[PDB]
Amino acid sequence: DPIIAKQLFSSLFSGILKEMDKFKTLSEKNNITQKLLQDFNRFLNTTFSFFPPFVSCIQDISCQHAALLSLDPAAVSAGCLASLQQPVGIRLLEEALLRPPDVLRWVELAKLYRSIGEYDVLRGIFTSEIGTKQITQSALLAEARSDYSEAAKQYDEALNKQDWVDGEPTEAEKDFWELASLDCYNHLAEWKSLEYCSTASIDSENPPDLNKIWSEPFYQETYLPYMIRSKLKLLLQGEADQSLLTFIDKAMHGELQKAILELHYSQELSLLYLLQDDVDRAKYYIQNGIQSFMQNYSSIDVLLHQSRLTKLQSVQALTEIQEFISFISKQGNLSSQVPLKRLLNTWTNRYPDAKMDPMNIWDDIITNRCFFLSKIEEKLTDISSLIRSCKFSMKMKMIDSARKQNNFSLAMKLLKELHKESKTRDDWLVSWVQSYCRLSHCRSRSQGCSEQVLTVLKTVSLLDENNVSSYLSKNILAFRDQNILLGTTYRIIANALSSEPACLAEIEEDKARRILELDSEKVIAGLYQRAFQHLSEAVQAAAGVIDAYMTLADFCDQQLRKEEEQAYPALVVEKMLKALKLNSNEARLKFPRLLQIIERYPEETLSLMTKEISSVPCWQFISWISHMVALLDKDQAVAVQHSVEEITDNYPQAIVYPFIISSESYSFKDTSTGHKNKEFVARIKSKLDQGGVIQDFINALDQLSNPELLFKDWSNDVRAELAKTPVNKKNIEKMYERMYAALGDPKAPGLGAFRRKFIQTFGKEFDKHFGKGGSKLLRMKLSDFNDITNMLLLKMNKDSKPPGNLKECSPWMSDFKVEFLRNELEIPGQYDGRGKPLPEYHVRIAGFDERVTVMASLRRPKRIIIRGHDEREHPFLVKGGEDLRQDQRVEQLFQVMNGILAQDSACSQRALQLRTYSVVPMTSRLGLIEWLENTVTLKDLLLNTMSQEEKAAYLSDPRAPPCEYKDWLTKMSGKHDVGAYMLMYKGANRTETVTSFRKRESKVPADLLKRAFVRMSTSPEAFLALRSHFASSHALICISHWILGIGDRHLNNFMVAMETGGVIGIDFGHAFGSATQFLPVPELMPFRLTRQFINLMLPMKETGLMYSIMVHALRAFRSDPGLLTNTMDVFVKEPSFDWKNFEQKMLKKGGSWIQEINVAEKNWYPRQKICYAKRKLAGANPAVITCDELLLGHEKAPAFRDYVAVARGSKDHNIRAQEPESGLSEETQVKCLMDQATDPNILGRTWEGWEPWM
């Protein structure tokens, strides 16, 4: 076994080098270490067989001592690239680049990061380190998205510069421009311009590409693959070129020119010998290619993902070469057409996937298949059309996949190269024209309003071509799609010149007259009619008609939300319900729009609403069941009664827990239409929970929650109502029954659920103190004294034992053991939209477990370890007293959020997906949350990475960052409580707080997250995997907690997954902007990007991985039809939190918000939150929205202009003070977001529990 020999030598040598340090002082020690360094250089230079547990052995023992770190940047990179052991040379070069020699080290580290994928870390060092110009930054910005036309334009516009008098570019960024030009010319199909750029550096005047590349081997690694690739890829379509054949012939004579050429490529060699018509050498080289693939794939480590992916994305082309050789060697395939037709039918069914394979894979497979079909049509001397139709269909599928990955300069050249063939038949023409129009519609979603008219005024005249002169009367699926795309075209024009009213028509010469022939307000209303007519013609003419419904539906819906400043409510309701009658999901999230339009326009279209909802499969409302059953109290519930009856008759388990939350509060009417509704609610209450076990289940769960932290909630309920004025009658009398049901006589909890073990020590002990309560407190009406309740509430927690130690505390569950058909429970947490469910195969609960575990918080939830009838064990979390509906709402928002992420190409290629869980509110004040296995909170991870002494030095010391902030706030203001923040904004300037923040954040250990990810990783090939996952997950939740504005992101709202290193986001108390608007000391930062998240990525900068993930996710978010805005609108206009639930849930945790109701009762305003979220989704300065929220919630306060001055910028140091208010872009938006999150003027002035330094 070579691995244990590697480990034994790597431990023995380091032990000897450690033990020699007593004698052999610094005179001889330096000579010994330089001789060891020279011998290691000699090993790496004279090796010829790169044995990987030898190469990795010497590169592992050099990295651990600070004398061999300056080993050999030229040899380390070559040994790791040839030995396929890159993540140890990466660690070696990074440890050298910590602590010119430090320029070629960045060149070799970029060479090592380029080979394992990792193109986001690669761009992050070509800006911070290989910089010194202002055109490299613009070119890399244009290449970070799939825009390799301007990005390669401004590289050849900078290599052949002449003077450029501001300095001279170095010799490290002068060939980097050539290499990046080769990359960007390779990303398109620029095959005539890649060979010239790759051969224009070895020599001049038609250079000798025969032996000049074989000496000075820098021309052998970089300029050789691009030359042979660009010449073969231009040979495969038909030319002569006579340059690669002769070079391969003259290079296949020797071993120095033969071993490299037959080891590295061999598949280019098989394609070349197939071009030279001989098959046996091609057979030998394709079998050598398959064997070399197997040898390479067996050496990449399994947890280096995307290296195995880009390795495995070539087996289809390899196997298609082998399959073409096998198809052409037989003689039965020649003279008969059925194996050819079977080959075509298996070719047009095995595509690479759109949206997931990059376009070089598509380019390889389609160019190979067209070469194969040309060879087959050569050897088979109708049948000429059956191959042309295959080639046309494959090329059009390639273009349709190319558009979806935002390759528009690559799709336009394919559409222009395919136009001449798409002329003879009409269906080819309409597919080409509709692909053209779809490309123009998906292209214009990012240009400004002045160019959005220009890019779609081209696709109007080419629809006045043929395919209208008697084609769209024989076929109907094209006649629908043309009307859909023309309506969308006029929609983009009419919304384009309405945001900018007339200046877009002013910047025109005849295009304004071409607009107006189809002022300044009477043409917009004509273009909306021109959009409406074409969108309404389509529904009169599976995903061929539900789009025809839903585009018209969303156009009329945005017309109504614009008209709020017509018989359109008739056209929204039917044309959304007829598409929900088919299985849709874009029509399934838009149903509360119908529930709001039938309320706001109720005088018409309501019997139509009943007649249209009367025939719908009643499983497409289980996501919206808690919205239709909250209409049971309210007037006009006759539009939804048959669906509730159908659900209670078919699935009487998935309506129960929304029924208990809505029967808790119901104030019915007295009119004749409000007369049958009481009978209906009584009917469903009688026919549901018929066995009488769901209420006993909920009662047995309610006995598990702590009552000592429920007496707190009852005291806060009664002291907020009784102790203001003696005019509010009998509310305390109606609300004392809730306290009497859980405390008082001991037979009432036995009648409710069971004889508790807690009531023997609670309800028997608190009788001689609560006889006074039952006598006087039931009829008190004094509203003056509460210390007699405070002194017993203070003594009730010194004798109470939150250890219950068993499941015998709630003994209905300890002996569950179901017997027969007596209404089995079916454990909650299923039935979430998602087609027609199968209730027989759902997990039924078949036992509890005899252990309880209390989680550490203030509210103390309880984890239960119950079992299932599949003999699994599910743990859950019981939280009693708290309305968990809002967490369920925002997790549904996270579900639609990472459903819209997975539809994006550049996000699904990196596998960006938010981590969700399940929350069920069984009744109000009682719910059930999922539990996550083997996860630790972020503060506990950082607190257990430390040592045993520095923990005490960090927690208990006067110079600790906790106590120093309190001393600083005492010094700057004067008062020793909250309110000193209000005087610190006016008693301090910028520089003092910035220097004090640096001085107090230079006291925590900087290597606190790298130490945690290196303590548990055991390998350099696992350190990379555990760090990049943490980076991607934290960047995704940082950008996702900003659109729907979530504050309070302190160190306990993040849970890391200690087997793979990924963060979870929890605890959504602030959903829209409220931590800055209603807390006393606001939160001015967008998210949490502190020092530890910065120092994890050293020596790389924040302009790499986190920057690219945030920009890609934000561009995924703000390119939508409006699903997220509609769902957030439905979330805020749901009447369950009208400042009262807000103040109750802020009361139940005693922090900083205390005793504030004078203006916030009349300043909730659910239109404002949607206005601000839509405004920041439309592109806005992140310090303008913050100042608007501070204006909305903090005026008539002393330090308000200081709030604006701190969270506005400084115009000298801050990039967010130099940019305009609106009309921004994604890259500059993320730049201002990173400037606001990392700002010592902000983090020096922030809440003391948010902990900005760590």
- Looking only at the bridges linking them, the beta strands covering 876-880 and 926-930 are antiparallel
Q: 1055 pairs with which residues across the strands?
A: 937, 1064
Q: What's the CA gap between 972 and 980, in Å, rounded?
A: 8
| Whole-Å CA distances, 22 to 25, 26, 604, 1006, 1077 | 8, 11, 96, 31, 64
Q: What's the CA gap between 288 and 399, in Å, rounded?
A: 33
By C-alpha distance, which of 980, 946, 976, 947 is closest to 963?
976
The 10 Å Cβ neighbour count of residue 832 is 12
Q: 1054 pairs with which residues across the strands?
A: 1065
| Whole-Å CA distances, 343 to 37, 377, 1125 | 60, 13, 48
Torsion of CA 1090, 1093, 1099, 1105, to 10 degrees: -120
Supply the DSSP symbol for 167: B
By C-alpha distance, which of 1028, 1216, 1041 is closest to 1117?
1041
Q: What's the CA gap between 5 and 769, in Å, rounded?
A: 76
By C-alpha distance, which of 337, 108, 88, 366 is closest to 237?
366
Please return the burial class of 436, using the count of CB atoms within 10 Å of its CB with bins 0-12, 13-18 and 19+.
Answer: buried
| Cα 1158–Cα 1160–Cα 1165 angle in degrees, nearest 5 | 145
Answer for the pair 435, 396: CB distance below 8 angstroms, yes or no: yes
Q: What's the CA gap between 1229 and 1042, in Å, rounded?
A: 12
| Whole-Å CA distances, 859 to 36, 115, 800, 806, 855 | 61, 51, 15, 19, 9
Torsion of CA 86, 89, 90, 94, to 10 degrees: 180
By C-alpha distance, which of 73, 90, 50 is closest to 299?
50
| Whole-Å CA distances, 335 to 322, 388, 391, 425 | 21, 20, 22, 29
Residue 1056 sits at φ, ψ, to 5 deg, of -90, 145
Q: What's the CA gap between 823 and 687, in Å, rounded?
A: 13
Q: CB within 8 A of 1251, min separation 6: which ones?
A: 1050, 1051
Answer for the pair 511, 456: CB distance below 8 angstroms, yes or no: no
Please return the burial class of 345, using the count of CB atoms within 10 Å of its CB with bins 0-12, 13-18 and 19+.
Answer: exposed
| Cα 454–Cα 460–Cα 463 angle in degrees, nearest 5 | 150
Q: CB within 8 A of 1094, min separation 6: which ones?
A: 1102, 1238
Q: What's the CA gap between 884 and 671, in Å, rounded?
A: 34
Q: What's the CA gap between 2 and 846, in Å, rounded?
A: 52
Q: CB within 8 A of 522, min separation 6: which ones?
A: none
Please return the burial class of 846, using the count of CB atoms within 10 Å of its CB with bins 0-12, 13-18 and 19+.
Answer: middle
DSSP string, 337-364: SHHHHHHHHHHTT-PPPTTTS-HHHHHH
Is residue 757 helix, strand or coil?
coil
Answer for the pair 605, 583: CB distance below 8 angstroms, yes or no: no
Identity of the amino acid at 484? I
- The H-assigned helical ranges of 84-147 are 86-97, 101-114, 119-122, 125-128, 136-144
Answer for the pair 352, 366: CB distance below 8 angstroms, yes or no: no
Residue showing tokens 């201002």? 1232
Q: What's the CA gap between 703 and 754, in Å, rounded?
A: 9
By C-alpha distance, which of 968, 1238, 978, 977 is closest to 1084?
1238
Is residue 854 helix, strand or coil?
strand
Q: What's the CA gap between 874 and 932, in Å, rounded?
A: 10
Q: What's the CA gap between 557 and 548, in Å, rounded?
A: 14
Answer for the pair 921, 888: CB distance below 8 angstroms, yes or no: yes
Q: Tokens at residue 1203, please? A: 């709030």
Residue 917 sits at φ, ψ, to 5 deg, of -150, -165
By C-alpha distance, which of 704, 643, 1080 is closest to 862?
704
Q: Please, which experimental method was used?
A: cryo-EM
Q: What's the CA gap between 781 and 786, in Å, rounded?
A: 12
- Looking only at the bridges linking them, the beta strands covering 926-930 and 935-937 are unpaired
Supply the DSSP symbol for 264: T
Answer for the pair 974, 1093: CB distance below 8 angstroms, yes or no: no
Q: 853 pairs with which residues across the strands?
A: 863
Q: What's the CA gap between 272 and 265, in Å, rounded?
A: 11
Q: CB within 8 A of 125, min separation 6: which ones?
A: 106, 109, 110, 1100, 1101, 1104
Q: What's the CA gap between 1170 and 1125, in Å, rounded?
A: 7
Half-sphere exposure of 414 (CA within 13 A, CB side): 29
Is residue 102 helix, strand or coil?
helix
Is residue 495 helix, strand or coil?
helix
Is residue 1222 helix, strand or coil?
strand
What's CA 341's distance to the chain center, in Å? 43
Answer for the pair 1074, 1083: CB distance below 8 angstroms, yes or no: no
Answer for the pair 354, 401: CB distance below 8 angstroms, yes or no: yes
DSSP string, 578-608: HHHSSS-STTTS-HHHHHHHHHHS-SSSSHH
- Looking only at the bridges linking them, the beta strands covering 1063-1065 and 1054-1057 are antiparallel
Based on its alpha-carbon atoms, the radius of gyration of the chain, rounded to whole angstroms, reads: 35
Q: What's the CA gap between 680 and 729, in Å, rounded?
A: 30
Q: What's the CA gap between 342 and 380, in Å, rounded?
A: 16
Is residue 819 helix, strand or coil?
coil
Q: What's the CA gap between 227 and 248, in Å, rounded?
A: 12
Q: Tokens at residue 82, please? A: 């040839």
| Cα 313–Cα 316–Cα 320 angle in degrees, nearest 5 | 155
Residue 1188 sits at φ, ψ, to 5 deg, of -70, -40
Residue showing tokens 């390119």? 1119
Torsion of CA 547, 552, 554, 557, to 10 degrees: -160
| Whole-Å CA distances, 336 to 339, 341, 387, 1207 | 7, 10, 15, 77
Q: What's the CA gap between 1161 and 1138, in Å, rounded?
A: 8
- Can you state the angle between helices 52-62 and 73-83, rounded to 10 degrees? 150
Which long-range contacts link 407-415 to residues 24+ away (Cβ below 8 Å)? 407/146, 407/359, 408/146, 408/439, 408/443, 409/147, 409/148, 409/149, 409/188, 410/187, 410/188, 410/189, 410/359, 411/439, 412/439, 413/188, 413/189, 414/189, 415/439
- Could you give the maximum distance between any two Cα atoms of the chain, in Å? 110
Domain boundaries, the chain: 422-541, 552-616, 618-688, 707-801, 935-1243
Supply the DSSP symbol for 910: T
Answer for the pair 657, 920: CB distance below 8 angstroms, yes or no: yes
By C-alpha distance, which of 806, 807, 847, 808 is closest to 825?
847
Residue showing tokens 């001393």? 967
| Whole-Å CA distances, 1168 to 593, 1185, 1187, 1188, 1189 | 19, 11, 14, 10, 10
Q: 877 pairs with which residues across the strands?
A: 863, 929
Sheet holding 853-854, edge to edge: 853-854, 862-864, 876-880, 926-930, 919-923
Residue 1099: asked if its preceding bond is cis (omega within 30°), the reply is: yes
Q: What's the CA gap between 489 and 467, in Å, rounded?
A: 18
Which long-range contacts link 897-905 to residues 24+ away (Cβ below 8 Å)? 897/1040, 897/1117, 897/1124, 900/1116, 900/1117, 900/1120, 900/1123, 900/1124, 901/1113, 901/1116, 904/1112, 904/1116, 905/355, 905/356, 905/404, 905/405, 905/406
Q: What's the CA gap between 647 and 734, in Å, rounded?
A: 33
Identity of the amino acid at 1252? P
The 3-state secondary structure of 991-1020 reads HHHHHHHHHHHCCCCCCCCHHHHHHCCCCH
Answer for the pair 391, 373: CB distance below 8 angstroms, yes or no: yes
| Cα 1058–Cα 1059–Cα 1060 angle in degrees, nearest 5 | 100
Which long-range contacts link 649-656 to residues 24+ away (Cβ below 8 Å)? 650/618, 651/619, 651/622, 651/831, 651/837, 651/839, 652/688, 653/826, 653/831, 653/839, 654/622, 654/625, 654/830, 654/831, 654/837, 655/625, 655/629, 655/688, 656/688, 656/689, 656/694
Q: Tokens at residue 1040, please? A: 């996702």
Q: What's the CA gap between 454 and 492, in Å, rounded?
A: 11
| Whole-Å CA distances, 24 to 12, 13, 21, 127, 951 | 19, 16, 7, 45, 38
Q: Tokens at residue 1175, please? A: 């405004």
Q: Tokens at residue 601, please? A: 């326009």
Residue 717 sits at φ, ψ, to 5 deg, of -75, -40
Q: CB within 8 A of 54, min separation 6: which ones?
A: 6, 47
Is the backbone of residue 1050 left (phi > 0), alpha (psi -120 to 50) or beta? beta
Q: What's the CA gap between 442 and 711, in Å, rounded?
A: 58
Q: What's the CA gap between 886 and 919, in Å, rounded?
A: 10
Q: CB within 8 A of 209, min separation 6: which ones?
A: 199, 202, 227, 243, 247
Residue showing tokens 């008209």? 563
